[PDB]
Amino acid sequence: FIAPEPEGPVAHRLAAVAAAIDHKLNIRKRGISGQMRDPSLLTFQRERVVVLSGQRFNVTVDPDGDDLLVTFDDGTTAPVRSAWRPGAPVWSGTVGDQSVAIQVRPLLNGVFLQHAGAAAEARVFTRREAELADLMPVKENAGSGKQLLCPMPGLVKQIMVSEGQEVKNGEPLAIVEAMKMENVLRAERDGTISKIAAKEGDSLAVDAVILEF
Amino acid sequence: FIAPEPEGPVAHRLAAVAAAIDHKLNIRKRGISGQMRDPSLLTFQRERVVVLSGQRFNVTVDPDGDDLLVTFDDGTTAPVRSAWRPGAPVWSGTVGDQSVAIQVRPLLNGVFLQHAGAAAEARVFTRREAELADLMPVKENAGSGKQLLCPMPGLVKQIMVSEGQEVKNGEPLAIVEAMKMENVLRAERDGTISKIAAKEGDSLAVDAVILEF
Amino acid sequence: LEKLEERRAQARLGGGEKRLEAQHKRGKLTARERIELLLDHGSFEEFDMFVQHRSTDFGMEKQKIPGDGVVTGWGTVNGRTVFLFSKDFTVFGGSNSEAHAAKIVKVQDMALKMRAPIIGIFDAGGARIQEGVAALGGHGEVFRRNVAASGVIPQISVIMGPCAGGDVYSPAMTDFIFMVRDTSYMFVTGPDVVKTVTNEVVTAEELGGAKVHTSKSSIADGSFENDVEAILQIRRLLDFLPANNIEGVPEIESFDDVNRLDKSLDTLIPDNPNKPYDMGELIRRVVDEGDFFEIQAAYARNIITGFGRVEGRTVGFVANQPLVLAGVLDSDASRKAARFVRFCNAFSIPIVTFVDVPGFLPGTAQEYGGLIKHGAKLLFAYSQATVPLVTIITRKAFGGAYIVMASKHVGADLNYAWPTAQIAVMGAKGAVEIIFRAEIGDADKVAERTKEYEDRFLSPFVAAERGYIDEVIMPHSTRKRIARALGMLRTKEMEQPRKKHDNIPL
Amino acid sequence: LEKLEERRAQARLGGGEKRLEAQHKRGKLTARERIELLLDHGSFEEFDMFVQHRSTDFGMEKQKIPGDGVVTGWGTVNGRTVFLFSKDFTVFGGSNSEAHAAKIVKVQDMALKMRAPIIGIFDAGGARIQEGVAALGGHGEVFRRNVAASGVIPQISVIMGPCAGGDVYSPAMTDFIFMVRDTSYMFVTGPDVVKTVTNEVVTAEELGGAKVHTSKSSIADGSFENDVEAILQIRRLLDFLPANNIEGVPEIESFDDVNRLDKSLDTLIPDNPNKPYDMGELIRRVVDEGDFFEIQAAYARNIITGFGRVEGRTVGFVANQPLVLAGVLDSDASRKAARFVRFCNAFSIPIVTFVDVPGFLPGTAQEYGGLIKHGAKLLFAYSQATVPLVTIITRKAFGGAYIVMASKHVGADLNYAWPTAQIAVMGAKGAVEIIFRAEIGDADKVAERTKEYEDRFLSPFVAAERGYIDEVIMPHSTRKRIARALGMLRTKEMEQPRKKHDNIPL
Amino acid sequence: LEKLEERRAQARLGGGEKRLEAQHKRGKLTARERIELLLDHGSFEEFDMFVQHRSTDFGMEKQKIPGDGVVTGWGTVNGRTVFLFSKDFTVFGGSNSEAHAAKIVKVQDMALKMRAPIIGIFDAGGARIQEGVAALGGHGEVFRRNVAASGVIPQISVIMGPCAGG
Ligand SMILES: CC(C)(COP(=O)(O)OP(=O)(O)OC[C@H]1O[C@@H](n2cnc3c(N)ncnc32)[C@H](O)[C@@H]1OP(=O)(O)O)[C@@H](O)C(=O)NCCC(=O)NCCS
Ligand SMILES: CC(C)(COP(=O)(O)OP(=O)(O)OC[C@H]1O[C@@H](n2cnc3c(N)ncnc32)[C@H](O)[C@@H]1OP(=O)(O)O)[C@@H](O)C(=O)NCCC(=O)NCCS
Ligand SMILES: CC(C)(COP(=O)(O)OP(=O)(O)OC[C@H]1O[C@@H](n2cnc3c(N)ncnc32)[C@H](O)[C@@H]1OP(=O)(O)O)[C@@H](O)C(=O)NCCC(=O)NCCS
Ligand SMILES: *C(=O)CCCC[C@@H]1SC[C@@H]2NC(=O)N[C@@H]21
Ligand SMILES: *C(=O)CCCC[C@@H]1SC[C@@H]2NC(=O)N[C@@H]21
């Protein structure tokens, strides 16, 4: 139904994995060419803040040779070992003692992690970056109207939904043929189909009414 | 009412003046810089064709010291002396024996001449150029739809005409104020004002009806 | 010797007597007649007269017409070397092919190598369908050479017939496009495909006629009544332009006087600030002999661009037109003036700017159309110019419009102002509304402050005290000051920083 | 020593604690907080911290705030030198003035002289009315330096607040404009003047909001949820871009492998010719690690532009999107791709092009909007490019659209084609109709000839036999071929003929 | 049109009739007379005639003289283009200021851009004390222009009065 937010050891493992991924990415990033002076003449901030879908973890990351060590506020240390590389959809490795596999989906300034039935957006900041990010407002979605319009002119070819059917997001609703190419329309909201304006074989202009939520 | 087309001696004088103006312009033009070789190594075609509003004159232009000598088909010669320079609205000089003054206005590939109550468009070609120009069709204007549309949004300032009044071409009809600037509309046809749709002070829109011819 | 002349005559016949007489019946000249009219008498030398196509698909090998639908060569216009190609509508409909494009490529290469103007005359029907992708390859070669020649030699396109499909993209990259009314049209997609796709019924004239491209789409720089008039005007235009980007503008003997005064200009500006005036009148008063070749006269008529002469040398002119849209700057005028200024700068043509502009056109239509970048185009063109820039402010110069219209801050060399100039951030009313926003409810106090602001700031002297205006001149001395300034500025040397090219917004 | 630190703290306070709290109340950061977030820790050096205005009109001398509404300086982003200025909304509303523009001019001069990127953060209210024409002069100086720096150093504008009047023209001539949703807007003319003139009631968001400029007007290259996300993405983009037009693209160590094959690409193209596919999937499967920074993602979605990495080096990508408008080329897509290609060529960024385009968008709306010149802009940009160009045709390449989309004929270095590519003048049906218009009435004959034309010409092999396609490659080796081609083409040397600049249509 | 002529005449008067008379009493020409003698007849075009200082310290705002103590422009000497500036001793003693140095910098930039000789006529009293370090900044800009133009265009300085300090 709705993906649970990670809790307890699952949350700690996700935070450690996110911190390790961020550390690896930062180490790779610091080796960019064209820098003003030698990158080695610079320090890396140990203190990191891992925001795990509205849950903060104050962690410190220290590389243990070929491994990484993540220490939390309560004193728990979770060594992280993996051969994961950016672009791999699955993060496989050991977080402390347990061997885990985590789905990694990148997003803006972070990654999206799924593990043990829990899903959370992971963003790793410094102290000051976390403080500045806390000032940003929480913006709510404006939703959408109950009418499914036709973005482009064309001919309706197929509609898979009927009257009085309940569908959710990410489901096809109609196919519009324009310039010898199909166009699949997907639901932007949820609601039982109350009235269908257009059927198969009907030529519709721009912004024509197709479905009523 | 309608400007008469030149006839007889007036037409001959207008043709001679047009030929002299064309000769002066060509002589000045041949002095342009950047030519491939010396312009003195080129020849000027004596034979010329002067078209005065659908009337052709086959003339030959020969320099005589400072002035020109224009010889027509029927043996007649007309020396042309003037101090006129391009940009001067009036051509003053002697064409043969008579001293004449001719109004000169700019025209596309020619000049517009007025003299002795006669007006004609003067174009001077070579024989081959005249032959090629004779192939061009005569295109007739269509006209307006007896309605004065407002080309820009604004507010009507003043209307100087009433219904059932005769207006000639170019007579102002209404003033439209837009962005702190007056706009004057002029009639594109002739007739009587059937009725007035927009009154002074009304805030019209784009392509709004003002009056019907 | 007689067989060679017989073959020459057969090649000159083109597609046959019937097709030539059909072409003449439509009121159009043939390609060779157009070439003969454009060039000086006896100066035309033709290239590749006997070139034939090598296609063997769909029975094309049974009809081999020499020239392959185009006449190429070189000649002189008023004694100056030019190159030209004229597409023959009677030979396969003028359609582009492999050998057709090869001939055009040869003439383009020679024009670029010799640093001479190249003239394109277009009367065709697109690319030859039977040829296949070879015609597309030849079109691509022509396009690449058009891009290479851009900014080096002037490229003039004369549309004297149909121009559809990939044909239109060759003139679009040239400096100037001229069309003949009622016989020429341009569009990427033809009316048949428009009907089959958009279910819209239009004719060729409605879709891409001369009026459409001269007043709506900004494609064409002008239109002419017929072929003879168009060709004679092309000959006239060639006398204004430099042969390349090195030799500079051509010079002729001027019949006008550079020291003459025009007292009528002292009363050109109306007393009423809401009364417009004709800026073209001022332009034709300033240029030599009143001779002015206007560019894009029917498009974006709130600004004026064109070529004139001062002391016998070509000068570009950009001027706001108060008669149209109060002389404001919108997207169309900005793009038109930007293209003109870029062309003048590329070929070392000095630019004289007359400024009377109250600001930019408001509304959601301008903002949704990208007025920001479109105005930035003109600003970029003016700031990028290294040619002499003489600016004369006549009535108004408000804010960003003042900055854009060749101000001293963007690199103008000399900035004159008439006594009626008003250089300020905005009008007095809006200025006092913004400044004295607390005491907005009053009426007499607001009027008094508005009068004070008008007397103190809406004048050319606040900018003069800051050095932004070099001199406040009498209107009757405009031509004299411009001529002396251009004579002094002929020796200007200036360069932009090294780069492959700039990133002007598109 | 203590008085200096006290003065520094007072200057850092800006317009006061109350105004800073009001700024934080709207969910926006302050100028100094934005600078701190953008740069590396402790790398910021500030210029002109104590600069004050010298205006004495309308009681301005009683309000002297150090900094004059802008924070300027330099720092490092990921160890690389950058320059930046951030307008302070709490100091006179961030409005431009003489000293404000002087500070911006100093930072611009230093950025151009050091050949380093310059970042502009815009949260202001236009130009200061009380300053008068001096603010306009400073704006003009800033505009001139923006034009001078164009094509030499990358210029990035981040709109994090209001931007109205003459302010908008400085970001407009920069390379990239990024906006923050729901808190930033751009327009030349404000809503009040729009209501006064056009009698139209709009808000700031409706007139110039982030959605308007990211999806409708082509002004902005992207929008972000809030300030922190925008600044982090700016850091990412800076890591993507070269420092100037000399050093070349930055290089990092890549975790991806250049010899890996992607078998899923063998089934990307649907069997049905009318079924669209996502070209973004191909782009993200070709780039390193699937990391792709898209440019103008919300505008003209029938084409895709953005930055990726191949073997750790920045590569530009242009690709038709079959999911939107069947992947056709229109004015918006042409202008977007042309600007992207011009930027990539100006800074020596190689471009990889994926081609699937059936032609151009037909209709009177495109022709009246100037589709000829807008389409020619992309062709001009591609033919002008001297950076490596690798083109891969996946499904379709028809007519002039094939020529425009970086064909071999316009200067592309390597042109690959998938086995499903169809390179022809047009579709089989229309080609048969044009060629065999005499016998169009016979249905079976028409079908037979259409099948013959489909078998003969709608394949990548007619172009391969003519040498227009270098190789027909298997879809699963696309990344390997691209990587090897770019590695080989890194040493490409090519130059356009000498000129001030080209005359690309505007 | 008549008010423009009146303003031009008032600007040409410089620092007053009596100061011009004292200048003639010393056997010295005025700046405008020197410019008129140097250039060809009718060839002088003046720049920044109405430029005024923006100083507000020590009561300087109560005396704003157009030109700010220097006359700049261009002309022809024997038909050849030259640029020149002549310091007006009757206006604040000819002392350099921010706008004074701005006018000199403009004329120097134009002379260098047009590749023409530039002539300097010096009759002044150093830098304006009330114009703080802004006067020094303008002096530095003039010095930078002088160094940049060295070896490119001929620079001629005519000392026809006091010249002290910077
Ligand atoms: C340009 C055009 C509007 C003008 O056609 P037109 O002015 O009415 O003249 P026609 O249609 O009678 O064609 C004239 C001749 O030229 C030939 N022709 C024109 N264009 C041709 C082309 N691209 N390839 C081959 N032949 C062509 C025709 O076969 C015809 O031969 P015909 O006289 O024996 O009949 C039309 O020919 C056209 O659209 N052609 C295709 C160009 C194109 O690509 N349009 C965009 C569609 S996506
Ligand atoms: C940009 C703009 C839409 C945003 O205004 P805003 O977001 O609602 O914020 P405000 O209107 O309350 O102005 C904020 C402060 O900055 C000041 N300010 C804003 N712009 C200014 C300017 N151009 N000059 C001087 N001060 C300015 C205001 O006086 C105000 O001071 P306050 O806080 O004591 O009231 C609006 O200020 C504006 O349009 N300014 C003029 C810019 C312009 O040229 N617009 C085009 C009109 S043609
Ligand atoms: C150059 C100088 C020797 C000539 O002075 P002078 O020829 O005797 O003429 P004056 O001294 O009467 O000064 C003339 C006027 O110009 C003004 N003036 C001269 N130099 C000035 C300066 N540098 N700043 C401001 N005002 C100045 C004086 O106030 C005086 O006004 P006044 O006519 O009402 O009295 C002298 O003015 C001087 O030395 N000035 C300072 C320049 C300098 O730096 N010298 C080196 C000292 S370290
Ligand atoms: C009176 O109505 C004043 C408002 C009109 C001002 C005009 S409209 C076009 C120009 N743009 C702008 O901002 N002001 C000018
Ligand atoms: C079937 O309807 C064929 C006509 C559609 C062809 C498509 S529309 C957009 C492309 N442009 C063009 O000329 N042909 C393509």
C400 in catalytic set: yes
**DSSP label of E127:** B
Question: How far is Cα B60 from Cα D302, in angstroms, rounded to an integer?
Answer: 65
Taking Cα atoms as reference points, which of B13, B180, B159 lies closest to residue B82?
B13
Question: How far is Cα D466 from Cα D408, in angstroms, rounded to an integer?
Answer: 11
- Contact E47/C471, CB-based, under 8 Å? yes
Question: How far is Cα D303 from Cα D331, in angstroms, rounded to an integer?
Answer: 11
Taking Cα atoms as reference points, which of E58, C500, C174 lies closest to residue D386?
C500
Residue nearest ligand 5's atom 10 by CA? D359
Contacts of C1 (CB under 8 A, 6+ apart): none
Taking Cα atoms as reference points, which of C330, C301, C306 lies closest to residue C240?
C306
- Contact E50/C488, CB-based, under 8 Å? no
Kindly list the protein residues whose Cβ atom lies closer than 6 A to any atom of ligand 2: D 92-93, 95, 125-129, 162, 164-165, 189-190, 193, 204
Look up residue D291 and give its two tokens.
């990391």
Ligand 4 in contact with D254 (CB < 6 A)?
no
Phi-psi region of C8 (alpha: psi -120 to 50; beta: other; left: phi over 0): alpha
Contacts of E72 (CB under 8 A, 6+ apart): E46, E47, E48, E84, E85, E86, E103, E104, E106, E107
Given a contact cutoff of 8 angstroms between Cβ atoms, the answer to whether A212 and A184 are in contact is no
Question: How far is Cα C407 from Cα C410, in angstroms, rounded to an integer?
Answer: 6
* B137 to B133, C225, C227, C228: CA distances (angstroms): 9, 10, 10, 11
Given a contact cutoff of 8 angstroms between Cβ atoms, the answer to whether D120 and D171 are in contact is yes
From C23, C53, C95, C96, the mutation candidate for ligand 1 (largest count of ligand atoms within 8 A of CB) is: C95
What are the strands, taking DSSP E only, across E7-104?
45-47, 70-77, 80-87
Say how many Å lie between the first and final Cα of chain B, rounded: 21
Look up residue C416 and give its two tokens.
């004159």
Taking Cα atoms as reference points, which of D380, D382, D404 lies closest to residue D506?
D380
Find the catalytic residue in C75, C94, C120, C165: C165
Burial category of C339 from C-beta neighbours within 10 Å (exposed 0-12, middle 13-18, buried 19 and up): buried
Distance C162 CA to ligand 1 centre (A): 8
Residues of C in contact with E74 (CB under 8 A): 488
Q: Percentages helix, strand, coil for chain E, rounded to the nearest 5?
A: 45, 20, 40
User: Which value in Å is the resolution of this experimental model?
Assistant: 2.3
Given a contact cutoff of 8 angstroms between Cβ atoms, the answer to whether D15 and D91 are in contact is yes
Distance C96 CA to ligand 1 centre (A): 11
How, if at all, do strands C155-159 and C118-122 pair? parallel
Closest CB to D402 among C136, C171, C505: C136
Ligand 4 in contact with D193 (CB < 6 A)?
yes
Candidates D130, D246, D328, D403, partner chain C, best to mutate (most C CBs within 10 A): D403
Question: How far is Cα C393 from Cα C286, in angstroms, rounded to an integer?
Answer: 14
- Strand (E) or helix (H) holding D144: helix D133-149
Phi and psi at residue A30, in whole multiples of 5°? -70, -10
Given a contact cutoff of 8 angstroms between Cβ atoms, the answer to whether A118 and A10 are in contact is yes
Question: How far is Cα B43 from Cα C230, in angstroms, rounded to an integer?
Answer: 25
**DSSP label of A179:** S
Check the annotation: does C295 bind a ligand. no
Question: How far is Cα C384 from Cα B5, in angstroms, rounded to an integer?
Answer: 53
How, if at all, do strands C389-398 and C351-357 pair? parallel
Question: How far is Cα E143 from Cα E101, in angstroms, rounded to an integer?
Answer: 10
Phi and psi at residue B109, in whole multiples of 5°? 60, 35
Amino acid at D18: K
- According to DSSP, the residues that pair with B211 across neighbouring strands are B148, B196
Given a contact cutoff of 8 angstroms between Cβ atoms, the answer to whether D386 and D496 are in contact is yes
**DSSP label of A61:** E
Ligand 4 in contact with B179 (CB < 6 A)?
yes
Amino acid at D505: P
Task: Indicate the angle between helix axes C98-114 and C133-149, nearest 10 degrees.
Answer: 10
Amino acid at C368: Y
- Strand (E) or helix (H) holding D404: helix D399-404
| Residue B192 three-state SS | strand
Look up residue B157 and give its two tokens.
């300032």
Phi-psi region of D125 (alpha: psi -120 to 50; beta: other; left: phi over 0): alpha
Amino acid at C202: V
Question: How far is Cα C232 from Cα B22, in angstroms, rounded to an integer?
Answer: 14
Q: C449-474 b/e with 16+ CB inside 10 Å = b?
A: bbeebbeebbbbbbbbbbbbbbbbbb
Phi-psi region of A53 (alpha: psi -120 to 50; beta: other; left: phi over 0): left
- Contact D276/A181, CB-based, under 8 Å? yes
Burial category of E136 from C-beta neighbours within 10 Å (exposed 0-12, middle 13-18, buried 19 and up): middle
Look up residue A20 and give its two tokens.
């390790």
Question: How far is Cα D153 from Cα C267, in angstroms, rounded to an integer?
Answer: 49
Q: Which residue of E has its CA nearest to C413?
A: E110
Question: How far is Cα C155 from Cα C153, in angstroms, rounded to an integer?
Answer: 6
Phi and psi at residue C276, in whole multiples of 5°? -80, 170
Look up residue C50 and give its two tokens.
């006997």
Q: Is B179 on the interface with D (CB under 8 A)?
A: yes
Distance C192 CA to ligand 5 centre (A): 11
Say how many Å lie between the first and final Cα of chain C, rounded: 56
Given a contact cutoff of 8 angstroms between Cβ atoms, the answer to whether C390 and C485 are in contact is yes
Distance D37 CA to ligand 4 centre (A): 40
Taking Cα atoms as reference points, which of C278, C230, C220 lies closest to residue C86?
C230
Question: How far is Cα E75 from Cα C461, in angstroms, rounded to an integer?
Answer: 24
Amino acid at C95: S
| Residue A196 three-state SS | strand
Q: Which residue of C has its CA nearest to E98?
A: C466
- Contact C467/E51, CB-based, under 8 Å? yes
Phi and psi at residue B189, in whole multiples of 5°? -150, -170
Taking Cα atoms as reference points, which of D137, B26, A186, D180 lies closest to residue C424?
D137
**Residue ranges in C219-264 assigned as alpha helix (H):** 227-238
Kindly list the protein residues whose Cβ atom lies closer than 6 A to any atom of ligand 5: A 179-180; C 189, 193, 196-197; D 328, 358-360, 362
Question: How far is Cα B148 from Cα B188, in angstroms, rounded to an integer?
Answer: 9
Given a contact cutoff of 8 angstroms between Cβ atoms, the answer to whether D434 and D382 are in contact is no
Candidates D50, D53, D54, D57, partner chain E, best to mutate (most E CBs within 10 A): D54
Look up residue D367 and give its two tokens.
């022709």
- Contact D251/A33, CB-based, under 8 Å? yes
Look up residue A31 and give its two tokens.
């080796």
Measured over the CA atoms of residue C37, residue C42, residue C46 and residue C49, the dihedral's sign is positive
Q: Is D197 on the interface with B (CB under 8 A)?
A: yes
Question: How far is Cα C469 from Cα C452, in angstroms, rounded to an integer?
Answer: 22
The alpha-carbon gap from D268 to the nearest alpha carbon of chain A, in Å, equals 16
Burial category of C291 from C-beta neighbours within 10 Å (exposed 0-12, middle 13-18, buried 19 and up): middle
Q: Please list the active-site residues of D.
A: 165-166, 400-401
Q: D362-394 b/e with 16+ CB inside 10 Å = b?
A: bbbebbbbbbbbbbbbbbbbbbbbebbbbbbbb
* C125 to B30, C187, C189, C193, D8: CA distances (angstroms): 38, 11, 12, 15, 72
Closest CB to C501 among D136, D423, D501: D501
Question: How far is Cα D199 from Cα D186, in angstroms, rounded to an integer?
Answer: 20
Other CB atoms closer than 10 Å to residue A95's CB: what's the count? 24
How, if at all, do strands B56-64 and B67-71 pair? antiparallel
Look up residue D32 and give its two tokens.
């100094």
C137 in catalytic set: no
Experimental method: cryo-EM
How many Cα atoms are found within 13 Å in the side-chain-facing hemisphere of D144?
A: 24
Closest CB to C419 among E4, E49, E106: E4
**Residue ranges in C150-217 assigned as alpha helix (H):** 169-172, 191-198, 204-208, 210-215
* D446 to C130, D358, D436, D442: CA distances (angstroms): 16, 22, 8, 6
Given a contact cutoff of 8 angstroms between Cβ atoms, the answer to whether C277 and C323 are in contact is yes
How, if at all, do strands D118-122 and D80-87 pair? parallel
Q: Give counts: helices (H), strands (E), chain E.
A: 5, 5
Given a contact cutoff of 8 angstroms between Cβ atoms, the answer to whether D77 and D235 are in contact is yes
Question: How far is Cα E138 from Cα D100, in angstroms, rounded to an integer?
Answer: 19
Kindly list the protein residues whose Cβ atom lies closer than 6 A to any atom of ligand 3: E 92-93, 95, 125-129, 162, 164-165
Find the catalytic residue in C132, C400, C411, C430: C400
CA-angle at C195, arms to C189 and C201, nearest 5°: 105
Longest dimension (CA), chain A: 69
Contacts of A83 (CB under 8 A, 6+ apart): A92, A93
Taking Cα atoms as reference points, which of D346, D359, D472 lies closest to residue D419?
D472
Considering only CA atoms, give the Rg of chain D. 26
Look up residue D136 and give its two tokens.
């306009």
Given a contact cutoff of 8 angstroms between Cβ atoms, the answer to whether D239 and A32 are in contact is yes
Question: How far is Cα B107 from Cα D227, in angstroms, rounded to an integer?
Answer: 62
Contacts of D173 (CB under 8 A, 6+ apart): C376, C379, C380, C503, C504, C505, D143, D146, D147, D150, D155
DSSP string, E78-125: TTEEEEEEEE-TTSGGG-B-HHHHHHHHHHHHHHHHHT--EEEEE---
Question: How far is Cα D120 from Cα D230, in angstroms, rounded to an integer?
Answer: 13
Considering only CA atoms, give the Rg of chain A. 24
| Residue B111 three-state SS | strand
Question: How far is Cα B121 from Cα D288, in angstroms, rounded to an integer?
Answer: 73
Taking Cα atoms as reference points, which of C35, C128, C46 lies closest to residue C86?
C35
Question: How far is Cα C425 from Cα D136, in angstroms, rounded to an integer?
Answer: 7
Taking Cα atoms as reference points, which of B181, B168, B175 lies closest to residue B198?
B175
* Chain centroid, CA A70 distance in Å: 23
Given a contact cutoff of 8 angstroms between Cβ atoms, the answer to whether C90 and C19 are in contact is yes
Phi and psi at residue B197, in whole multiples of 5°? -90, -45
How, if at all, do strands B195-196 and C155-159 pair? unpaired
How, if at all, do strands A209-212 and A166-167 pair? unpaired
Say how many Å lie between the first and final Cα of chain A, rounded: 21
- According to DSSP, the residues that pair with C305 across neighbouring strands are C295, C318
Q: Is B153 on the interface with D (CB under 8 A)?
A: yes
Question: How far is Cα D158 from Cα D38, in angstroms, rounded to an integer?
Answer: 11
Per this entry, what is the length of chain C?
Answer: 506
Other CB atoms closer than 10 Å to residue D496's CB: what's the count? 17
* D288 to A86, D283, D311, D480: CA distances (angstroms): 9, 10, 7, 11
- Strand (E) or helix (H) holding D100: helix D98-114
Contact flag for A and E (3+ C-beta pairs < 8 Å) = no
How, if at all, do strands D80-87 and E80-87 pair? unpaired
**Residue ranges in chain B assigned as alpha helix (H):** 9-29, 127-134
Q: C102-136 b/e with 16+ CB inside 10 Å = b?
A: bbbbbbbebbbeebbbbbbbbbbbbbbbbbbbbbb
- Strand (E) or helix (H) holding D227: helix D227-240
Question: How far is Cα B5 from Cα D186, in angstroms, rounded to an integer?
Answer: 61
Per this entry, what is the length of chain E?
Answer: 166
Given a contact cutoff of 8 angstroms between Cβ atoms, the answer to whether D95 and D126 are in contact is yes
**DSSP label of D57:** S
Counting ligands in written order, which one lies closest to the CA of residue D90? 2
Question: How far is Cα C87 from Cα C170, in angstroms, rounded to an integer?
Answer: 13
Question: How far is Cα D166 from Cα D126, in angstroms, rounded to an integer?
Answer: 6
Say how many Å lie between the first and final Cα of chain E, rounded: 41
- Strand (E) or helix (H) holding C156: strand C155-159
- Strand (E) or helix (H) holding D354: strand D351-357
Question: How far is Cα D32 from Cα D11, in angstroms, rounded to an integer?
Answer: 11
Contact flag for C and B (3+ C-beta pairs < 8 Å) = yes
Amino acid at C117: P
Given a contact cutoff of 8 angstroms between Cβ atoms, the answer to whether C293 and C314 are in contact is no
Question: How far is Cα C198 from Cα C202, in angstroms, rounded to an integer?
Answer: 11
SS (H, E, C) C71-118: EEEEEEECCEEEEEEEECCCCHHHCECHHHHHHHHHHHHHHHHHCCCE
Q: Percentages helix, strand, coil for chain B, rounded to the nearest 5?
A: 15, 40, 45
Question: How far is Cα C476 from Cα C325, in angstroms, rounded to an integer?
Answer: 27
CA-angle at B121, arms to B116 and B123, nearest 5°: 125
From C324, C328, C330, C434, the mutation candidate for ligand 4 (largest count of ligand atoms within 8 A of CB) is: C328
Which ligand 2 atom is at minimum distance from the Cα of D128?
24
- Strand (E) or helix (H) holding B58: strand B56-64
Given a contact cutoff of 8 angstroms between Cβ atoms, the answer to whether D283 and D308 are in contact is yes
Taking Cα atoms as reference points, which of D340, D377, D339, D383 lies closest to residue D494?
D383
Which ligand 4 atom is at minimum distance from the Cα of C426?
14
